[PDB]
Structure 1
Amino acid sequence: SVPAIFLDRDGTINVDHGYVHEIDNFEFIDGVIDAMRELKKMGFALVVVTNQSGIARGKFTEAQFETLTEWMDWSLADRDVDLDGIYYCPHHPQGSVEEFRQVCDCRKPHPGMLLSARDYLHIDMAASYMVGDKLEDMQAAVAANVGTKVLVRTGKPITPEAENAADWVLNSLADLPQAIKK
């Protein structure tokens, strides 16, 4: 079993402009790419787990999400960051788009995505981290029995509830490798 860093996307990896689905609006947060590269060096699997309800909302299609996700994957790989898994939930109970309109197991704070990754990559959850800027991230982690829950300040002005649920609060994903080294 391998330990992993589970990663929220908007507000953690890219700047959260809300319903981000275009390459020219995808902006990597400073230092996160180097941080992820170091996390790989330190022996962690990297797994993105991201809610994308904009799909259910009709803000953008699944096709558009794949295009952006593919681009993200290459950009990282080309910087010698090779993501071990990318999971997303396109659902929302009130989705305007029929295909995606539903309650589900995979929308954070449901731990579904993390459990799927766990089974797939044989991940050591207790030895793993979850990084995000929202409560739903911390709660998802709690349910999936992730060892360490890390909240970041690069997205949402953190709520006291999110803060409560978190084990650590870091300014950024960029700071995670040093925090773990220590």
Structure 2
Amino acid sequence: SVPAIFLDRDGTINVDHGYVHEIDNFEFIDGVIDAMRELKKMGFALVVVTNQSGIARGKFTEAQFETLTEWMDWSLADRDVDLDGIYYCPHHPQGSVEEFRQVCDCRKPHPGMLLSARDYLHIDMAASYMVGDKLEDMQAAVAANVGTKVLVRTGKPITPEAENAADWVLNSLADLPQAIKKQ
């Protein structure tokens, strides 16, 4: 029913400084808020799908993630970017925090989060995009039938394996609207 842009968070929306969990260490990457507003204007739903194993690691709590996520959601809404959904996976099989220690269906490369978003927001997966900086993001997208897999260079220098699983490689999410328009 609606096309969406699925978005990784660290390395794609914010600079990945290391288990980011505080407002004062959350830096939006150049041009992404403007690009996101334009993607909403084009008609795309926007959905964040982020692995946050820092929670399972005990680096920060689900409460602190919630606080930072609320701050981010407000900051975007206030600049006219209303996110359609925000999904996150706090688990890790070796988690030190018992509550979050498990294999799950939501940890990318597993496509769980994308499937839930799909069912909840009625998303046309074939008309959608996944944007992220890691192999795991592109593997979750292929499992979820996302039409275009986009890798960005704003986080981790990509690996050849992440490149192989992607359809496009862009410098940044900032460049996605133009890249889509040229289609």
TM-score, normalised via structure 2 length: 0.99
- Cα deviation, 1:49-102, whole Å, max 9, x if unaligned, reads 000000000000000000000000000000000000000000000000000000
Matches of 1:177 and 1:136 in 2, distance apart?
Answer: 23
Matches within 5 A, 1:123-162: 123-162=123-162
Which secondary structure does the structure 2 equivalent of 1:146 belong to? coil
Identity, in percent, stands at 100
Structure 2 residue aligned with 1:180 = 180
- Cα deviation, 1:90-119, whole Å, max 9, x if unaligned, reads 000000000000000000000000000000
**Gap regions ≥5 residues in structure 2:** none
TM-score, normalised via structure 1 length: 1.00
- How many angstroms does 1:146 deviate by? 0.1
Matches of 1:153 and 1:37 in 2, distance apart?
Answer: 21
Provide the aligned length of Structure 1 versus Structure 2. Answer: 182
Which secondary structure does the structure 2 equivalent of 1:49 belong to? strand
- Cα deviation, 1:133-173, whole Å, max 9, x if unaligned, reads 00000000000000000000000000000000000000000
Which secondary structure does the structure 1 equivalent of 2:64 belong to? helix
In the TM superposition, structure 1's runs of 4+ consecutive aligned residues that sit over 2 Å from their partners are none
Matches of 2:136 and 2:22 in 1, distance apart?
Answer: 24
Structure 2 residue aligned with 1:105 = 105
Which secondary structure does the structure 1 equivalent of 2:88 belong to? strand
Matches of 1:46 and 1:137 in 2, distance apart?
Answer: 16
Matches of 1:79 and 1:174 in 2, distance apart?
Answer: 16
Matches of 1:52 and 1:18 in 2, distance apart?
Answer: 11
Matches of 2:127 and 2:24 in 1, distance apart?
Answer: 36
**Gap regions ≥5 residues in structure 1:** none
Matches of 1:87 and 1:18 in 2, distance apart?
Answer: 19
Which secondary structure does the structure 2 equivalent of 1:88 belong to? strand
Which secondary structure does the structure 2 equivalent of 1:158 belong to? coil
- Cα deviation, 1:17-41, whole Å, max 9, x if unaligned, reads 1100000000000000000000000
Question: How well do the aligned residues superpose, as a CA RMSD in angstroms?
Answer: 0.2
Which secondary structure does the structure 2 equivalent of 1:118 belong to? helix
